[PDB]
Symmetry: D2
Subunit: 211 residues, 4 copies
């Protein structure tokens, strides 16, 4: 399986870029079991929160941007099995309640796997599993604007709590943990999903692999 | 009169820095006519909008961040008279209605004048009237967060229109017109009003001038 | 119609080497001159002819070869336009050692893909719109200054102190004022220049696909 | 208690010259050694003693003098602490030419104001908290590389290629990893280094005020 790692800051466009790639590849018109290109999100691997942690999260006082927030062991284990051509089950994360669902997603063997997340390149062992590394680079202020609108209409958050959480944990964590991984990227994609030339370049490359 | 120019991006903390300086100098406990240090805002010199312009402004589709948005002639004329020790009248701008008020402010001769604005260093003639140039440097994302809260509670704006206006005009104008003037600053003050050491340095310097 | 790819980046960013590598990997350095499917055009080939006093200053590293005015922008646009029309063009040959245009020229026959590289390839809107793909080779300024020093001393017969003087006085200011503002027009940013094998192979594959149909 | 001012910035940013200018303008280069009211301490005075193989590597520009481990951080903290206690201290003298600590030393008597400058002056939290004011001299990396090259060749007897190698391999990476992250701790940022007369006079006036009472 050809693994492509995608990173970038929060709301940089990582998710929309991956979605557009599979969409342009016609994967949305293919049966779930027949998909040749699948998208795996790092957010699906957020650790289960403890009572105290969830309490803070509800107040926007928990650091979901720190490397420890993700179950790195599970991520590595899952990606390795995928590279081995095995079928795996991945967790389903609910941003609204800061928790997992009892339902999991079946990830069948695909020819190409897109793994995206704010800290997809943080771990060296994970990084070495990617045959290609893309980093979506979008200005911090632009990303904040996007996150505010997205979080309010999709993650059930409030403006003030969003800005507070962002300035207190998100911004600092981005500079300390995310930004430093940009150097590992092979190709930088500015702006995001509206960058059609960049997206089509990845699509053609993937299509070439499928053939 | 000792003129101090202060610039920086929107919501960088220019206004709060100047306010804190005069506050620490005890100027808030001095009668209006007796003030030795006065603050002049560049926003007071926004040009009067035409019908079409105001219509766009209401939609957040007018560029208030472009150099042309300010009456540069009036600014230069006013600052020159101030350097001449003359009493002048300055306009009063209402951000809520995107317009001036019929009432003006009397600016009496002061020993020290603080002139602050996003484009205070844009004009060379104006820039040369400043004996000291300060630039308040605060990260773009941090400034956006501040502007959103400020604009909503002080300028009668709506979140969506604020983000739209910011991404469409504010951000581009900052990079093209404001940021390039940072090189003219003598001293850079990071973060803003919470930077007590920096503020106290300016206060002591001004106090030295007053003596 | 020819597929034009614009490539920019600061001096010594790796632009030239990246383009050379791509063309080499495409096996074009084997194809007949008149059968070339992928060619490279350099913006430096269009540097203007210097006058007597200009060349004198250049000999002292006192001429600004980094300002848009240093290039014959009209000739660049006309040439690119003629290329998109499938016409054979004549390109000048520049000599960095003598700061002059050589008498010898390079004829470029109709190609399927054209790579145009230069420190200011994205400066002109008209030129930019002629590119179907825009790549920016991003390499830190301090890294590029190191590379430029070694290159100019060993290849362009320049003196160390003159290189640093020229760099601080003209190269750096012009890059920040005229080149940096154009980075936003690039579709893809390529780091580590010529050593970025993944990025290079990606472009090669894309071009090979365009050639196949 | 002595008023400590920490000063940082990358190599050749103008840190040393700024501090020297301030002290000169304060008329301290006239005051008796034992009557000095304002003194300057350099972090480079605390570079560690190199072993046989370390010095050999250093002679080839293969040793990392930019990593926090290159300095005797404990001696720095102890010395600063003793200074804040109003005690007379003994400071080592470093020789950049031989990569070694000299046998001669500089005695620093109780001062009212102390300037501590170094490429990593803000790296240690304990050290940072000892500063009542933190200044960062911000000068672009390419500008600093140019200055460093000229300085090392003419003052530290280094070879051009070795300087560039050392810079790309250690100086640049260490600056970005260890120094840049500390810039956020500075209270005031000073651009244009030693040529910034306004900023320098501002600091001088502030210090003179502290001395007057
Ligand atoms: N070009 C664009 N213009 C406007 N909104 C955009 C653009 N690209 C992305 N967005 C919006 O930004 C938000 C975050 O994008 P997303 O793709 O989820 O990024 P990430 O995966 O990096 O967090 C979404 O609400 C998305 O619709
Ligand atoms: N350190 C700070 N922490 C939180 N909010 C701040 C801080 N500094 C400024 N602000 C807020 O940011 C907004 C913009 O600051 P302002 O001083 O008006 O800046 P400017 O004059 O540059 O537009 C205000 O609502 C202000 O209260
Ligand atoms: N990975 C690398 N490491 C060190 N030097 C390099 C590297 N890649 C290129 N160079 C050197 O950098 C100089 C400029 O590279 P070049 O490809 O011509 O860039 P540009 O076209 O942007 O000027 C050359 O002298 C080249 O040998
Ligand atoms: N304005 C300037 N223009 C050119 N060179 C300068 C300037 N200011 C300082 N330099 C040179 O830069 C080098 C380093 O300056 P220095 O003050 O020692 O900085 P730092 O203490 O940060 O290493 C010296 O060789 C000095 O002569
Ligand atoms: N429960 C959770 C889990 C993650 N997050 C935020 O989600 C982000 C990562 O997702 P994106 O890449 O979709 O922005 C982080 O920056 C983290 O702040 C959250 O706000 N609440
Ligand atoms: N009528 C007006 C006039 C100015 N402005 C905005 O006010 C800003 C400048 O003020 P601050 O420095 O207070 O942020 C600009 O960035 C401009 O966008 C506005 O939003 N409506
Ligand atoms: N005669 C000339 C013409 C150009 N140049 C320099 O050549 C550079 C562009 O070449 P590269 O793209 O090969 O780096 C410019 O930065 C310009 O300074 C020069 O140093 N002498
Ligand atoms: N023996 C030594 C000790 C330090 N250094 C360099 O000296 C620098 C710090 O000096 P400045 O602050 O004077 O620039 C570092 O960047 C370190 O590389 C050296 O080149 N040889
Ligand atoms: Mg996402
Ligand atoms: Mg304001
Ligand atoms: Mg070339
Ligand atoms: Mg020193």
């Amino acid at each position: 399986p050809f693994l492509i790692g995608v990173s970038g800051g929060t709301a940089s466009g990582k998710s929309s870029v991956c979605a557009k790639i599979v969409q342009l590849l016609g994967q949305n018109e293919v049966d779930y079991r027949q998909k040749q290109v699948v998208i795996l999100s790092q957010d699906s691997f957020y650790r289960v929160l403890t009572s105290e942690q969830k309490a803070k999260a509800l107040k926007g006082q928990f650091n979901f941007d720190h490397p420890d927030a993700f179950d790195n062991e599970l991520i590595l284990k899952t990606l390795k099995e995928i590279t081995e051509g095995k079928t795996v089950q991945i967790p389903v994360y609910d941003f609204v309640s800061h928790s997992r669902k009892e339902e999991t997603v079946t990830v069948y063997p695909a020819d190409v796997v897109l793994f995206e997340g704010i800290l997809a390149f943080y771990s060296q062992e994970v990084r070495d599993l990617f045959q290609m590394k893309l980093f979506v680079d979008t200005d911090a202020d632009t990303r904040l604007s996007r996150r505010v609108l997205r979080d309010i209409s999709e993650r059930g958050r409030d403006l003030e709590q969003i800005l507070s959480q962002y300035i207190t944990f998100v911004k600092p964590a981005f500079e300390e943990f995310c930004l430093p991984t940009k150097k590992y990227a092979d190709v930088i994609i500015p702006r995001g999903a509206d960058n059609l030339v960049a997206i089509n370049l990845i699509v053609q490359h993937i299509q070439d692999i499928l053939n």
